[PDB]
Amino acid sequence: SGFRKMAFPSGKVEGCMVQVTCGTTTLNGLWLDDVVYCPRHVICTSEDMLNPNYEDLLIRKSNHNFLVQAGNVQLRVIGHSMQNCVLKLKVDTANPKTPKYKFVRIQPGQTFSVLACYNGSPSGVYQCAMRPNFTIKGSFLNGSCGSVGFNIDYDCVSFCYMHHMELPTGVHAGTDLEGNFYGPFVDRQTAQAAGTDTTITVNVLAWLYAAVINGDRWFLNRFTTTLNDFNLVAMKYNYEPLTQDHVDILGPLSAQTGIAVLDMCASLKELLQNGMNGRTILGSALLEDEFTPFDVVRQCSGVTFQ
């Protein structure tokens, strides 16, 4: 038993991390085959971030301006190209540790593991979720740009995030591995609007099911609620609308615990209105929304990977 925030094993991603330097800016790059992916704003200076012209800046840059290192052994940049907000630094050596990689663009509510790197060296791994406002609550300092988020299907590493920048609130934003930002953000140092964050309801319900499997059962009621009456209670506390598809996704968890989704909704319908009086659920005093239904099945069935 037990329940903790689990990140995927980072072994297959550590071998793809390199150091990328352009002038005085040093950040991380993703070395897959003979291509090195990194944030395109590595070619900028201090006052270039304020209003950059990336086309004009890349043109004044040449191949010997990019310094790519993989540990002590180096790589020679052969051809630089731009794809949206990421830089394609092609090299003369193909990565022998290239795994079965995969480029995916995730939806708000899905979780992934982040391998935080500095100077091309892995520092730590942790799990987080893409918030409904297309930001992530991660842990990043200077030098962490280029760190990637990923999942493992089985042997297929699914890259889905690359860190770019930090918001004034303290959350973080980035792109997929094709250079397209998550959200309405642009890679420019200027104040931009960020949306209001909501609570992922289908994730809170999966977390409550995890609490039932582990023994926490006090939050449970005997009543039921509609699929519409619950949405009234949800949409006040800035919770996210619950659909019929979410009920079908929670099938496995509903069948193992013998508690219908609409029954667990009635338990959640009561918790949001009254509070918790000062109790705890799974060792937490707040409701957790960073566990997808699939994350709960992994921790309560032992799903392993390559």
Ligand X SMILES: *[C@](O)(C(=O)NC1CC1)[C@H](CCCC)NC(=O)[C@@H]1[C@@H]2[C@H](CN1C(=O)[C@@H](NC(=O)NC1(CS(=O)(=O)C(C)(C)C)CCCCC1)C(C)(C)C)C2(C)C
**CA–CA separation, 46 vs 203, rounded Å?**
41
> What SS3 string covers 230-293?
HHHHHHHCCECCCCHHHHHHCHHHHHHHCCCHHHHHHHHHHHHHHCCCCCCECCECCCCCCCCH
Could you say whether residue 193 binds ligand X (CB under 6 A)? Answer: no
In the list ligand X, a second copy, none, the entry touching 187 (Cβ below 5 to 8 angstroms by class) is ligand X
| Stretch of residues binding ligand X (CB under 6 A), selected from 11-19, 183-191, 199-207, 286-294 | 183-191
Helix or strand or coil: residue 29?
A: strand
Say how far apart CA 74 and CA 76 lie, in whole Å: 7
Please report, in angstroms and rounded to a whole number, the separation of the first and last CA atoms in the chain. Answer: 23
Active site residue 41: yes
168 is an interface residue for ligand X by CB under 6 A: yes
CA 270 from centre of chain: 30
Looking at the Cβ atoms of 144 and 267, the one nearer to a second copy is 144
Task: Please report, as residue ranges, which positions from 196 to 235 form the binding site for ligand X (by CB under 6 A).
Answer: none
**In the annotation, is 145 catalytic?**
yes
Would you say 187 or 288 has its CB closer to a second copy?
288
- The residue within the footprint of ligand X, chosen from 6, 49, 247, 297 (CB under 6 A), is 49
Asked whether position 85 contacts ligand X by CB under 6 A, the answer is no
* One-letter amino acid of 275: G
Strand partners, 181: 175
> Judged by CB, which is closer to a second copy: 135, or 201?
135
Q: How far apart are CA 209 and CA 251, in angstroms?
A: 11
Total interface residues for ligand X by CB under 6 A: 24
Under the criterion CB under 8 A, does residue 128 sit at the interface with a second copy?
A: yes
Rounded to 5°, angle at Cα 136 from 135 and 142: 105
What is the binding site for a second copy (CB under 8 A)?
Answer: 1-12, 14-15, 115-119, 121-126, 128, 137-144, 166, 170-172, 214-215, 275, 278, 280, 283-286, 298-306
Residues tagged active-site: 41, 145
What is the binding site for ligand X (CB under 6 A)?
Answer: 25-27, 39, 41, 44, 49, 140-145, 165-168, 185, 187-192
